[PDB]
Amino acid sequence: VASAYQRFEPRAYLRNNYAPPRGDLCNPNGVGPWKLRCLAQTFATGEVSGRTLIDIGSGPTVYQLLSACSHFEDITMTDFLEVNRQELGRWLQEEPGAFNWSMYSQHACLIEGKGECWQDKERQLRARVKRVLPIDVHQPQPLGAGSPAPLPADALVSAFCLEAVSPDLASFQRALDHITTLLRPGGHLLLIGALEESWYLAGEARLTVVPVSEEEVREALVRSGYKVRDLRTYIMPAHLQTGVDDVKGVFFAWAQKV
Ligand SMILES: Nc1ncnc2c1ncn2[C@@H]1O[C@H](CSCC[C@H](N)C(=O)O)[C@@H](O)[C@H]1O
Numbered sequence: 001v002a003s004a005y006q007r008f009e010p011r012a013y014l015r016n017n018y019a020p021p022r023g024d025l026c027n028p029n030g031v032g033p034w035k036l037r038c039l040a041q042t043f044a045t046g047e048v049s050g051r052t053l054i055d056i057g058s059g060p061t062v063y064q065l066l067s068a069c070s071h072f073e074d075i076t077m078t079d080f081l082e083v084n085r086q087e088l089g090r091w092l093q094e095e096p097g098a099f100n101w102s103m104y105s106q107h108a109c110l111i112e113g114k115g116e117c118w119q120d121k122e123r124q125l126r127a128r129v130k131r132v133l134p135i136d137v138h139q140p141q142p143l144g145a146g147s148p149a150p151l152p153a154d155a156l157v158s159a160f161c162l163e164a165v166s167p168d169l170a171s172f173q174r175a176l177d178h179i180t181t182l183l184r185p186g187g188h189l190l191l192i193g194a195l196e197e198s199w200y201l202a203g204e205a206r207l208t209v210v211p212v213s214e215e216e217v218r219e220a221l222v223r224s225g226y227k228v229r230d231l232r233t234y235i236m237p238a239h240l241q242t243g244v245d246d247v248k249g250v251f252f253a254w255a256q257k258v
């Protein structure tokens with residue numbers, strides 16, 4: 001798969017998944033509002049706390065950290081591609097042509113409901129993201145040996161990565177074992193991913209995906225040494241079925257390392 005991700009277009013991917021219709025957060029029944037709600041509700045329990053946190057396979061997105069950022073002071077974002085990391089930095093610095101995550105930032109404020117303004121939220125996130133590093137979940141030591149990243153992390157967040165870089169179940173399983181080592185025993189893992197998806201586009205690139213079920217994700221979290229605190233499913237409605245992929249649903253898992 002690694003070679004397929006070489007033709008990956010960050011802007012095409014962002015437009016396919018974070019721009020209307022999926023990027024229209026006005027409909028409370030959309031996938032965006034759901035993902036944000038899961039993340040928000042989870043961090044609102046105050047069980048996922050700590051000093052450091054790592055985002056595995058950040059890609060060119062930041063929504064996966066909006067609620068998280070206020071509970072951890074050292075945030076590490078990662079990704080296998082220079083192009084993505086470049087895109088991340090473009091938003092982190094507020095340079096020209098960064099992607100606009102304001103609609104997302106705003107809804108995270110809505111959902112959390114602490115009266116915070118979206119600029120302060122975006123400001124906090126940009127402040128707590130200390131670094132954007134390269135990563136390969138396939139290497140049994142994903143980040144490397146002398147990674148500038150604090151290890152082990154207190155928590156982990158990963159959205160649409162593992163199943164999007166694994167040819168089959170076993171690879172998905174090992175990939176989890178790999179990143180799972182980056183997590184402190186007792187730490188927390190927040191995994192978001194596609195259910196029963198087998199491909200999705202990113203411009204000229206056509207990525208292969210491993211179709212997984214909710215049950216298969218659960219058993220994989222256990223086999224990796226986690227206590228599944230929560231695991232819910234979102235069924236992709238017709239209006240959000242657009243051709244950019246064949247995803248059937250989206251899963252959210254809150255897992256704690258034994
Ligand atoms: N071997 C590998 N290990 C880790 N990440 C990889 C990888 N191969 C590709 N990736 C990256 O995994 C990402 C999958 S797309 C997911 C993007 C983002 N997390 C979101 O929620 O939308 C891409 O950014 C891709 O570059």
Ligand SMILES: N[C@H]1CCc2ccccc2[C@@H]1O
Nearest residue numbers: 017031160194197200245247
């Ligand atoms: N990889 C894709 C899979 C389908 C999907 C659906 C809603 C939100 C994100 C995504 C992933 O980026």
